[PDB]
What does this fold into?
Amino acid sequence: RTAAGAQILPHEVLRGADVICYNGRRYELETNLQHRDGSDAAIRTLVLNLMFSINEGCLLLLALIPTLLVRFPIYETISSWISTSSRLGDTLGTRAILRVCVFDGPSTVHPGDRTAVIQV
Amino acid sequence: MPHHPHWVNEHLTILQFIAPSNPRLRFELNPAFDFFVAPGDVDLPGPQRPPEAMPTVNATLRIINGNIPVPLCPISFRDCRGTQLGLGRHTMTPAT
Amino acid sequence: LLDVEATLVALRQQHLDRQCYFGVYVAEGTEDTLDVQMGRFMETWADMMPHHPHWVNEHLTILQFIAPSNPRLRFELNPAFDFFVAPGDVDLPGPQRPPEAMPTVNATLRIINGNIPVPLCPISFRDCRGTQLGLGRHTMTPAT
Amino acid sequence: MLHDNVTESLRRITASGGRLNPTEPLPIFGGLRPATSAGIARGQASVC
Amino acid sequence: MEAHLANETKHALWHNDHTKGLLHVVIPNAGLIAAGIDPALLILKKPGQRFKVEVQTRYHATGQCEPWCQVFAAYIPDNALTNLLIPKTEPFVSHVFSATHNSGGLILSLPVYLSPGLFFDAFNVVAIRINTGNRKHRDICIMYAELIPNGTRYFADGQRVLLLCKQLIAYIRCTPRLASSIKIYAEHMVAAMGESHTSNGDNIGPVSSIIDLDRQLTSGGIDDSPAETRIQENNRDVLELIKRAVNIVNSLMEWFDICYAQLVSGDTPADFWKRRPLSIVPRHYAESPSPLIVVSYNGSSAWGGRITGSPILYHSAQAIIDAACINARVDNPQSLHVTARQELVARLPFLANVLNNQTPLPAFKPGAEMFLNQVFKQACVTSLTQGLITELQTNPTLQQLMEYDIADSSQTVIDEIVARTPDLIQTIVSVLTEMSMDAFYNSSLMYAVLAYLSSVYTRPQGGGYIPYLHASFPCWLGNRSIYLFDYYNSGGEILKLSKVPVPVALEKVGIGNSTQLRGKFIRSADIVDIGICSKYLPGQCYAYICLGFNQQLQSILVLPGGFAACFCITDTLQAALPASLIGPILDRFCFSI
Amino acid sequence: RAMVQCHVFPHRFISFFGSLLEYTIQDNLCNITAVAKGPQEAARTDKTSTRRVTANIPACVFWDVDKDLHLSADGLKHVFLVFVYTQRRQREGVRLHLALSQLNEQCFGRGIGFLLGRIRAENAAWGTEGTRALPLVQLSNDPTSPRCSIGEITGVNWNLARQRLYQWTGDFRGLPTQLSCMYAAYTLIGTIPSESVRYTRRMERFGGYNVPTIWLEGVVWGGTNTWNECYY
Amino acid sequence: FTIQGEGHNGETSEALNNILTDDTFIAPILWDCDALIYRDEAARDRLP
Amino acid sequence: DLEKNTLTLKNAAAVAALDNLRGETITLPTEIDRRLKPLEEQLTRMAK
It folds into this structure.
């Protein structure tokens, strides 16, 4: 969406074929396009940082030594990239704690029934 | 021609008329004033280039027995009426 | 249109017999005059038929073909291809002089529609449905 | 075979009714789970 | 259009070897009606055949050949033009646009030569290999003149897009949905295309806009050549100066793209190139009424593309030849002066190999394989019949010698066939001038004979003779495992009966003295379309005649009646046919790694 | 073979499941319950042949590791499930091994790579399916720096001044490397209540045929199917 | 008797329910020379 | 008998070139007329 907005020439392909099912079912998701929300003001900075990190990581390979190719210390950017990667290493950790132990199935014919759970 | 012809077929009697037809049967509600659809901003007579306005459901007068469908009225009733009316007047079939 | 392979294999392995290959060979002719054609016809009529065909007693068949055993008709396949066995193997056009080749089984598409009496409604049913569909269409006087 | 459009048109013609549409399309890779019936207050019959 | 686009990455990654330039060529399927085959088995039906198409070159008295090209394609029925021109809208397919009964299409790869020394002539025939029946394959053969006609259609493509855009605008405007912003911006865009063209003329003007090919494939061949551009600019300058003299003396789709992406929500490869002018290079013929439309990319500096300046014209290779020919008023360059020959050699390096008279060949006939193979087959059959008749004349003993499984009540007619051997050989000799020659011109016998000669003369420079795929698999190391038997009737008339030969196993019992023959069978679990002629017993109104051949061109007679002759014709072929007749055969049927 | 050759990994959807342990029979019906980690052998269900429960594993459960782990295994061992992947020329296969080592989880990938070093190079060479450097940066960093990424762009249209720039003398589209180097995986499935487990090779007679089996003790199941792979 | 007015993009009723539309089973009496033209214009996609 | 095959192949390969050249010159008179059309306009301007 940001590329289409800032490109003044969007690509006609935006969805393709992305349908999520479950044992032959229908999800009916992403059925709105004109709807706008204020939650997108915080993800633009995140995606910009992610793409900057990707660019610097893929550019440092060709700046150090081309092994696969047959007043400026140039260290502050590398140090900042390493620090941001180390900071995001703990942020990306979202390991689950609770465990689900479903007896038979409550949603086999109708979701929203008696469901079992454990604390392992 | 935007699509296939709507109801040009004339081989429907009871089920061949009530099973596949739905847009042509929804407009038949009461035998007093039929209704029909037409695009909006259309004059009678209209201009050369058809307009592109929002269609509006119009109405058609029933001053004559023309809008009555054929399939729901069998020819047996008409034949019975003709035979009943042909028994009190002169009948000269062969010469005519 | 897909299960005919099994029937073809079955008829190939059945090792059936065939007769009257000259009739089904259909000799072709290019740039041939009528005199040559009639001479060839006379020559074939002289001695071309090995044995008398069995497909000629169709006068009294309605009862005489159903009352006794019908081994030839009981091998009838699905009603989508012809059922006839005769030595063919001809090109387009085929050979001119028909030789004595090995018997083969050939089938065509569903062009034949004359098999109404036996495998479908009988002649009486055909007449009844015809007279039901058509009552009278400009009947003529007996004198005319 | 090369009959997809013809058979789709035939099925549309034969299923273009005007009474009730519980189930009809049944697309590919579809489940079409049965709907929820009533409770335990019903009768008894049979089908054929 | 998807497989070719996926395979284009191999050509895109190429940097060196500019002598093979891949381009998009569309071949109409109008000629498939005369093929006589099933179109269902040509796209996707019963996988396993692995149909492939190969492209090879054919030189003339120079030697060597192109090492083929691994390419493939697929057809598309049911109005391929509709789905290749109109963008794909399968989820919301409706009655969009209007067109007549269209046809299919195919994409074939044809390498081209690009270099500073371009040059152009018509002396090379492109051979196309099709994995179908060899009997009436219905192939085509064209020279290099039709491949490069030096022309393009750049002006006729402008009006084609206008009709489509007008139709799509009318379709969008006919449905009263969305909001008035789309309508008002479309009206503003329409009005922006002209002041008096819309306010005083018409906005859309459907009039008689019918999708048809009338003025698109008729005119526009040579219209953007540099000479034509110079003439046009001179005419425009003349008009401008005339207008100036008369005056002196009297007496922008960004919103459209966004809306299209929002509405259609789907992209096809045939939409990105619509924004730029295209190129059409038709090459029709009288064999079939179907132009050979050629589409070239506009964003790349390929053949026919116009993105940076003057494209490839294939010039500076005809004026010199014409001047040399007209200098002495002689069309043939062989009878020209020494100075003309030297100039032709200097200007054309590739023409120096013809003046030296190397690799002699009668005239210049690229299509010599057909009658060459016909002559080879005739010579081999005459040698075989001479050998069999000589062995029959010099055949010792009489009647049957070994046992032979013959019924007691059926042996009364077995000797009749043996006693008619002179009649049989006379009929075989006489049938050479009566039977059709189109039935044994593409059989397995000629292929086996050609594969047998591959052992001798393994290229002038060497080669291991290791094919990749789709080659002579039955004939790899020896022909003693797979046999070819032809069944013929007896009497005074012999005609072809079977269609495809079936191998028959054979073994010898006795290990000396009077040898015995007893055929066997091998159980196969890969095919069920096997005839019962081979399994037929020797009895039951006699049998056929079999003459097997090994890899050493040794023929063993399997005629029933206790007669067996062994003759070799491997040295007769070399004596009658010298080694100078295998020139084109070695040039074409050769490969190395 | 069809589902493997298409470069599709089905392990991304497999979740942890319990082990069934129950003996019952009915009329064309069988409902077998499952257990988890806990005092299964101490609950004294009294439903087996003996007073306790039976815990056995097939022959293909352990692989030789002493050649690289000659040091004594002083500690609690762990059971790991290994499912490697192969990538060759139109040929592929599966290998559902069962590793059992006392090494750390983070070193399991390194050990697998070291053990399969003779085939890792071949896999990397066969996985490459689907050029001028810039050594003047060290000299142009401080001096002669044409830093005009804003002044020369926001001011001029830049539609005609883009002439020389850089070209890289190449053309590439797509460098798939993440889906080519993935050949090692391990998951913590199954533990042991006690260490120093000794295995004995014996024979068993059950059912309609006698098959070789290995009897073990002090082995339980459970855990989680946490996929944490380390490709090399 | 048959339904007229609906069909595919080519023929509507003639080639579908004419039976003897092909000029091969006709009597061997002719008076014109356009029989071949009619055949190749009718059976265009039927191996002409 | 190879001369007949050779001449048939030559005719088949040359028919495409011949009729392509014939069709290329169809629009040549129209091109000449449209190129000489500005000359008529110049003559009319000179007369005026």
Observations:
- The helical segments of chain A are 2-7, 43-64, 76-91.
